[PDB]
A paper describes a structure:
The [name] is subdivided into two functional subunits, designated S1 and S2, that interact non-covalently after proteolytic cleavage by furin during synthesis. The S1 subunit contains the receptor-binding domain (RBD), which engages the receptor ACE2 (5, 7, 9, 10), and the N-terminal domain (NTD) that recognizes attachment factors. The S2 subunit contains the fusion machinery and undergoes large-scale conformational changes to drive fusion of the virus and host membranes, enabling genome delivery and initiation of infection.
The B.1.617.1 variant S harbors T95I, G142D, E154K, L452R, E484Q, D614G, P681R and Q1071H substitutions whereas the B.1.617.2 variant S carries T19R, G142D, E156G, L452R, T478K, D614G, P681R and D950N substitutions and a deletion of residues 157 and 158 (157–158del). The B.1.617.2 S structure – harboring the F817P, A892P, A899P, A942P, V987P, Y707C, and T883C VFLIP prefusion-stabilizing mutations and a native furin cleavage site – was obtained in complex with [name] (an RBD-targeted neutralizing mAb) and [name] at 2.4 Å resolution with all three RBDs closed. E484Q, L452R, and T478K mutations are part of antigenic site I which we previously showed to be immunodominant (16–18). The B.1.617.1 S and B.1.617.2 S structures resolve the complete RBD and provide high-resolution blueprints of the residue substitutions found in these two variants. In both structures, the L452R side chain, which is part of antigenic site Ib, is oriented identically (and modeled in the same rotameric configuration) to what we previously observed in the B.1.427/B.1.429 S structure. These data concur with evaluation of the effect of individual residue mutations on ACE2 binding using deep-mutational scanning of yeast-displayed RBDs, the positioning of the R452 and K478 side chains away from the ACE2-binding interface, and the conservative nature of the E484Q substitution.
Author numbering:
A (entry chain N): 1 to 107
B (entry chain E), C (entry chain H): 2 to 123
D (entry chain K): 592 to 621, 641 to 675
E (entry chain D), F (entry chain G): 2 to 105
G (entry chain K): 14 to 18, 23 to 69, 78 to 145, 150 to 155, 158 to 176, 186 to 244, 263 to 346
H (entry chain O): 1 to 121
I (entry chain A): 347 to 518, 520 to 591
J (entry chain F): 396 to 493
Amino acid sequence: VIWMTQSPSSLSASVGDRVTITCQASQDIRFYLNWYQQKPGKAPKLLISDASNMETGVPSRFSGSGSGTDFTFTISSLQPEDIATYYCQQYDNLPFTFGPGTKVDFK
Amino acid sequence: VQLVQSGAEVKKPGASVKVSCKASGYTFTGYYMHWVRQAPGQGLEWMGWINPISSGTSYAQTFQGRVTMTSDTSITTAYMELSRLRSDDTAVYYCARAAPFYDFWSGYSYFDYWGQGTLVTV
Amino acid sequence: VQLVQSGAEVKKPGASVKVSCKASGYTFTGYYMHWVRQAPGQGLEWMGWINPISSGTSYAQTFQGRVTMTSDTSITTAYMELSRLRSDDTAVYYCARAAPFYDFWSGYSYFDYWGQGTLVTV
Amino acid sequence: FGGVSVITPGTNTSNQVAVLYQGVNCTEVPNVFQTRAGCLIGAEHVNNSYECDIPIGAGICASYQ
Amino acid sequence: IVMMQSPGTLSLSPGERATLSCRASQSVSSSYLAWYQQKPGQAPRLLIYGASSRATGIPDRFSGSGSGTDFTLTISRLEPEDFAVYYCQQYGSSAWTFGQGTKV
Amino acid sequence: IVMMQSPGTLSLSPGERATLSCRASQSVSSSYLAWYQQKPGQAPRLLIYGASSRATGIPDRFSGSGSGTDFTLTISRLEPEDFAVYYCQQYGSSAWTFGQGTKV
Amino acid sequence: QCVNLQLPPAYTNSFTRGVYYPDKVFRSSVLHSTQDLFLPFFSNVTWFHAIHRFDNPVLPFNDGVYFASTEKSNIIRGWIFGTTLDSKTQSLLIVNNATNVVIKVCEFQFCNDPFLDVYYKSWMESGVYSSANNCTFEYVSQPFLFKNLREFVFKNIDGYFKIYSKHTPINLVRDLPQGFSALEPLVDLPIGINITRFQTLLALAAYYVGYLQPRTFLLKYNENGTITDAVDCALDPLSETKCTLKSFTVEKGIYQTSNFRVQPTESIVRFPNITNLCPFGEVFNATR
Amino acid sequence: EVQLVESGGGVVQPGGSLRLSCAASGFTFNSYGMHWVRQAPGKGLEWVAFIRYDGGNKYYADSVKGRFTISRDNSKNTLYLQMKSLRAEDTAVYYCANLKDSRYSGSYYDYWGQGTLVTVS
Amino acid sequence: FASVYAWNRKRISNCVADYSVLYNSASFSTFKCYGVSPTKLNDLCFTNVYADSFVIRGDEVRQIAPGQTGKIADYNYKLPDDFTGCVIAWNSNNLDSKVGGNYNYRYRLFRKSNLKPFERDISTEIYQAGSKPCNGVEGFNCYFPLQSYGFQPTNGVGYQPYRVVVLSFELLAPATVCGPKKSTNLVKNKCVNFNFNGLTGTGVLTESNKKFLPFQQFGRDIADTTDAVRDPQTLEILDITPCS
Amino acid sequence: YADSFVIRGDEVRQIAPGQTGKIADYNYKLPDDFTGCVIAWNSNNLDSKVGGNYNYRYRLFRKSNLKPFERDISTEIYQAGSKPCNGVEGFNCYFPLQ
Ligand SMILES: *[C@@H]1O[C@H](CO[C@@H]2O[C@@H](C)[C@@H](O)[C@@H](O)[C@@H]2O)[C@@H](O)[C@H](O)[C@H]1NC(C)=O
Ligand SMILES: *[C@@H]1O[C@H](CO)[C@@H](O)[C@H](O)[C@H]1NC(C)=O
Ligand SMILES: *[C@@H]1O[C@H](CO)[C@@H](O)[C@H](O)[C@H]1NC(C)=O
Ligand SMILES: *[C@@H]1O[C@H](CO)[C@@H](O)[C@H](O)[C@H]1NC(C)=O
Ligand SMILES: *[C@@H]1O[C@H](CO)[C@@H](O)[C@H](O)[C@H]1NC(C)=O
Ligand SMILES: *[C@@H]1O[C@H](CO)[C@@H](O)[C@H](O)[C@H]1NC(C)=O
Ligand SMILES: *[C@@H]1O[C@H](CO)[C@@H](O)[C@H](O)[C@H]1NC(C)=O
Ligand SMILES: *[C@@H]1O[C@H](CO)[C@@H](O)[C@H](O)[C@H]1NC(C)=O
Ligand SMILES: *[C@@H]1O[C@H](CO)[C@@H](O)[C@H](O)[C@H]1NC(C)=O
Ligand SMILES: *[C@@H]1O[C@H](CO)[C@@H](O)[C@H](O)[C@H]1NC(C)=O
């Protein structure tokens, strides 16, 4: 079992602000990490795979990078539509695991 | 088994001090290294330990956020660094050896070897 | 490992000299014994080797017919004798240890231990 | 547990088969006819009597018609 | 946990027997109780571990016993070198705790 | 075969890096190339063998490399004790040959 | 340069396709039973039309792939096999052209919608990837690619990428042909990489994709050592009978072919409800 | 075009069992490995199980291992999860999903179902 | 050399393998073969050869064998019971030991289960000895899974470093690794003893009318015997008929 | 029959049926159907000397393994390479004993 953590567990930001979310693994997982975004009442949506590869249809304001145990998710300019809980997930080894989840609120 | 520590140091409040402890006569990574403080006229206080194989540590609540422990296996030496020094940190600091937690006969519960202490004045 | 050689000798042209080398700290018959000459102000010249287990030898073309090497395992000592001495044989003579030719990692290609040399004047 | 037998006409005639589950109830298996030999599935049971073609057991036979 | 030793100071002659006590505020496993001896100007050294087991190099003039909340250290016949400060130490809850020490 | 070292003499300060070269008239296996250090009034001692491997007791301040006809010996930071004469040695055709040596 | 270019899948029936020579042993006039990764008989094979609107998806490789296409236009040129299909890992690029086939394994940074230009960097580079580095494998040989039907089987076992192929004529439009034809070994590539996904490269387009399974087959070799027929032993009770009797022809009668058994639904454990522990430590840590 | 619809959710007692299913359409279901993921009210995402495209190999989280069984019917494009010995802690919304995975399933596209609530009480 | 927990593997193929230079060496302290005689290796052909290498201590060398137990056999490097290959080891005190201790070489001390044959585990996950989850934190009942040897030049022999090489012989397919045996002229229409890429037997060789495909190397009978081969040099197909 | 000789401690395990090693292969070989007893004791007090006792020797190189109870006391130079030694010790030409 590879344990995943995220920090901060919650942050507040306004529109146009830069939002960064940190995810860490208890084990080295190279670049095999997904980033998800979830809004209330809906299933999670994948934004980034393999650490830094963007999914088709995902706004260019979203990005990410990292390797080994330390990964970062970034929103260069927060939109009013980006208010959601973000999760990191490792798929280096089964069982697969999700992080605690980071909530981004509006300031 | 021998444990040799650095000489006495004198610091001012707000400063930081680093005390070394060189080990010999045994497999360095086979044991935990503990630090124990003895203020003048006082008893003994446990500060924390480091495990050289993993560089993992644990600290007494008293010093959490103030004390950092490191080690270097290439020279079988352990270090303890205490920041934000105050006058009440004046003490003789000792390094001591104890078994790891996986020791079947609970050799981790006590300290079998001690180095001579390092006197630090603040 | 130690190699101890005899003291300096003084000879006249046409004479012969014998230099000994006593070995200790290792299995005597496990290694070849080589002799190397260093004339004053000059570099190093290889003379030949002896294998104590077989008493087999090999000599550098330069000295063939002039130099003889022997050994005695009962006293772990090697000897080198050079006949028909000339003034140009004035040199410091060293004994040196190297592995036998069957050494897997080519320990025979170099000399890992040297004795202090014997000065011979002609 | 039990054996499984396949009842067939020659492949020179047809590719249809029936399956007999030996010594078991038809209720435990998953044209279903229960016989003393076991549960026969894929064959239509009729009230007509014919000369025996492919023997099943206990007086029951199967044929391709 | 609190480790309390008694008496704070003990005075007796050479050649006589001494007993030191250590009490715990809560039950302590015998395997987690140790005694140390500290001479003036020197680092502490281990004498007893596991309540009753002597450390390597320690004379049979030293012994220990006890269980639960009550432990003792006994010196059969004191030498001039035994007039030092003794400490009891306990392990538990991922921490190491020493008593205040007693002087002989 | 001929083993030629260069420069014949090297001059530099303590604390500085030095490089010595040895060239062969013909290809030499890396396994057959060695370096020796000879101090004044002393027998030669082995520093490097197999082109790159340090001899027992030799500081990591010394290293070697090379192949074919071109080999080098490097001293990362010189001490007062490193100012000696260095030799390269080659084995082949059942014979052992030394270079002329260079003085540091 | 890279440029930007989902639809529901269609399905067809693979009646008796995807069979290949399981090893390198010559056999003749014999029925041989083997176990290997084969395409199941009468399975549902996915039918793609990459150029309809462009939709040429990345597919899972799983345990091996059955791939087929029919065309005279020579639109399909090659395949990409790998994992992330970017510069982070090694990827396998197999590309055909007019005179040769080139197979490379490198850290390719592939285009989002990779393809080959009909007219042209390099003929295998411009429309496929933006860059390549750290190449570990290279191989060049002859091209791998009425109506012409081309069938391939891709396996990746113990570091070896195995390709089987067969080229036959066809007079059908919307499906795969019936009858039996075995695929022969084309090349065994000692590459040593992991493959989880693959994509088809087109020149600027219909193809079929099936998946192999661990299956038992009875193969019929003729007097020339050619496989002319086969039985999928798990297809139906009749096929099971044929495999059991090692024969492609079954006479009238009743045959015992197998056994049935009811499997356990769950596991239960019932131990004594004592809680005291055995005093082993009292033995191990005794003073004397 | 691609749809995933869960069903079988409801209210059961502790120690009981519940069988979930998910109907897949719009994609070649049998070429993809499938995952189950659950999310309790007010909680984050928890991975439950994974099944391969063929339906052979099966993987479980330690939190469900020995109690939950994953299976698939490739003739009906339907994913199943059979949960035995259900506990109060198993109350959550369960999703069927095809998670993007470059190492195991080789899934390039990421799909999620609607989510069905399972209550144990 | 690698640590035993993170052992190295090299694949060897498409070459001539002289095994006598190793076997007849005086420099190896251990040379043990399983499933094959050390004196017959030069007469054999294999599809692949694997060479695994690592450092362990002297006393542990006995664990590098089929059917063994212990910390190395169980958690670091496991061999199969039907192993075919050779285990070679030698003392490396002069290279791997340091004054003060060499702590570069490590081994796995704790694991939740035994390794399978040729399995390699290089994780550093904290080992849970108790019932309470560690959550990546080392402490009571939560151990760091690895430990160092700390090799020193003054250690007893059982505690000195040994370098180990394991040669695993893969026999399946066309062979790519053969011993240094010299070939002879091909003889037909006579009763001969033959050896084709390690395939030995007795019989009369004649030109075959069997239409072998380019990938096929030999034919087989129902008795699991070879009745035809492709000659490794001429690629000619020959029938094998038993001597009268 | 009573056979006797000197070996070193670590090699005592080679004096048994089904064993391999320099002693088992080139010096003293027992049969697999051996009937008999192997008896050994430490002789450090008799056979060791200060400076080393080099009287006891063993065969290190041989072209083939010995048969059971075969005795080989030759000193022929061992040819490790392809070139003939012709009785001359040197590269790829070893003295068989140590
Ligand atoms: C001796 O051992 C007794 C039994 O405890 C059990 O075994 C020991 C070794 C540990 O594994 C422990 O966790 C087990 O419950 C102990 O009760 C006793 O205190 C031990 N005595 C000493 C001096 O260690
Ligand atoms: C097989 O079928 C043919 C007709 O197609 C028939 O003439 C022949 O007799 C049949 N053979 C048997 C054994 O029934
Ligand atoms: C099994 O078959 C027998 C005989 O037909 C019948 O009496 C019995 O009720 C059947 N059992 C069940 C569960 O239907
Ligand atoms: C056989 O006869 C029974 C009455 O005994 C009747 O119920 C059944 O339907 C008949 N079956 C057929 C195939 O005629
Ligand atoms: C086909 O590929 C080969 C090898 O890269 C190349 O030399 C040749 O020119 C190519 N032909 C065409 C038409 O691209
Ligand atoms: C090249 O690829 C190999 C894997 O085939 C990898 O181990 C190596 O690190 C890569 N080289 C670079 C510079 O990334
Ligand atoms: C296979 O996967 C492993 C683990 O991620 C990786 O180290 C290796 O490079 C991969 N093989 C490749 C990229 O060829
Ligand atoms: C076998 O090959 C011959 C030609 O050599 C051909 O006439 C014959 O029909 C083939 N046999 C089969 C079953 O195709
Ligand atoms: C193929 O698809 C049909 C529905 O179109 C289904 O009934 C059949 O069972 C499927 N067969 C397989 C092997 O998936
Ligand atoms: C060597 O083998 C090849 C086939 O692999 C053959 O073409 C060639 O003629 C052979 N050479 C000799 C001297 O036999």
